[PDB]
Amino acid sequence: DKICLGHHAVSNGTKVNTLTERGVEVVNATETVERTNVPRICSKGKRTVDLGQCGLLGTITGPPQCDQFLEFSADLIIERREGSDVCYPGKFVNEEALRQILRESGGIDKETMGFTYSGIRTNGATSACRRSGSSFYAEMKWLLSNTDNAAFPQMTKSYKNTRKDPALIIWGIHHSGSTTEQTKLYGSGNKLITVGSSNYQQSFVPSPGARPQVNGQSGRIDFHWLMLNPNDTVTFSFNGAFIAPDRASFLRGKSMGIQSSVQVDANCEGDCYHSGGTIISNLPFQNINSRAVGKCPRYVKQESLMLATGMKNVPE
């Protein structure tokens, strides 16, 4: 006598929002915002370097904690809160720029600057940098006057980059904890260091004085850097208080750098990382960490945005 048309329905629908209404109940729906974090750095298949105690900028200068990271190779570089760039206290000028360069480097290759010295000492060492006895930054040389109080000679040292890629060149200016210490190490007088390339132009005069003790030392070293272009030359004209580079650094290729507080895991894979771990998801959005890096779902403020995958639910 009659045939009637209809559609399915369920007792327990799922609420979604539309242009016209909040909390419309539909037969089924699915989440578009990722909330689940994996509390590990998911590193399966990636050449990974976990710096631990070594500060990223220490890979260039070489305090004792960075001895095993002087020429690393990596797809993924992990900095840790406990990492330190220094042994004898000090810091890099333009430090974060240099960190950003090294994070993307793919690692570093090192080559000798070819500097030889006469008329001065080359073996400055300190109890702040220990390798079973007093020592110093593995990639640098603390140049001193031949004997106590002696005049450091006016020196010039040159290095040409004969490779096809830019060379990362570092040096340091030593600020003793006192003027008397400055004289004892490098002789009296107002010291000077100039550094120039075809691209670069900058000078340095030391300023000794008492800083509060760090790693048992009241002196400081100002570290500085420049990228030396292929077949360009850097000249160092100095007359004391100069921490000379022993080796130049070259970038190997490409990598990504992260900062994290969680363990590496080679059993999971992911490309979106933050300090608390890895966001593994195919969803378009995430509400886990606005500073996640790599290849990530877009960060949004909402905890949940349900996408309807069914018709409106109309139970009897």
Binding site: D1, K2, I3, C4, L5, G6, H7, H8, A9, V10, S11, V16, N17, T18, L19, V24, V26, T32, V33, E79, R81, E95, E96, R99, Q100, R103, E104, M256, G257, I258, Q259, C272, S275, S281, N282, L283, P284, F285, S290, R291, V293, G294, K295, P297, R298, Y299, V300, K301, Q302, L305, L307, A308, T309, G310, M311, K312, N313, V314, P315, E316
Partner: protein
């Protein structure tokens, strides 16, 4: 919905319909029976599946760190970075909200559309042999056995066969 069938002239859905999304429920001398419609169900499913294929992904766009959680960057540049990041957060949160609301409106209207299309397709099959109830029901005038009901569902129904007796039973 825009087409006024689902949550419209059709009073409510069927919890017993577990075989498909849209279906037929009949009444005849032989009793009552329920069967799902494959084409309408499949069209709705394929369209929803298509939406998911588009949305459920992230891009191959890599971003690197531009600030530092262990050693804070210089305050001025840090404030520019935060302002930019917060501006992006606002843009994307707005985008996400609107995308899902738009898609959801369309999804509900799309399901309602498929229900309407199925109703009108049946209406055309049964021309003059039946009349619309108004509840999504077609009152058939001639006797329609299970083979007759199955012919309507299977789209093999021949109205000319029954037209005379049905027209007489106006």
């Amino acid at each position: 919905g825009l087409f006024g069938a689902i949550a419209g002239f059709i009073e409510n859905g069927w919890e017993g319909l577990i075989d498909g999304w849209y279906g037929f429920r009949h009444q005849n001398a032989q009793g009552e029976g329920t069967a799902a419609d494959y084409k309408s169900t499949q069209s709705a499913i394929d369209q929803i599946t298509g939406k998911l294929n588009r949305l459920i992904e992230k891009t191959n766009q890599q971003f690197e760190l531009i600030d530092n959680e262990f050693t804070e960057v210089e305050k001025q540049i840090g404030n520019v970075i935060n302002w930019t990041r917060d501006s992006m957060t606002e843009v994307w949160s707005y985008n996400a909200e609107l995308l899902v609301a738009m898609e959801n409106q369309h999804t509900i209207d799309l399901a309602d559309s498929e229900m309407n299309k199925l109703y009108e397709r049946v209406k055309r099959q049964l021309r003059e042999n039946a009349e619309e109830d108004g509840t999504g029901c077609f009152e058939i005038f001639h006797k329609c056995d299970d083979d007759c009901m199955a012919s309507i569902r299977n789209n093999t129904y021949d109205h000319s066969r029954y037209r005379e007796e049905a027209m007489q039973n106006r």
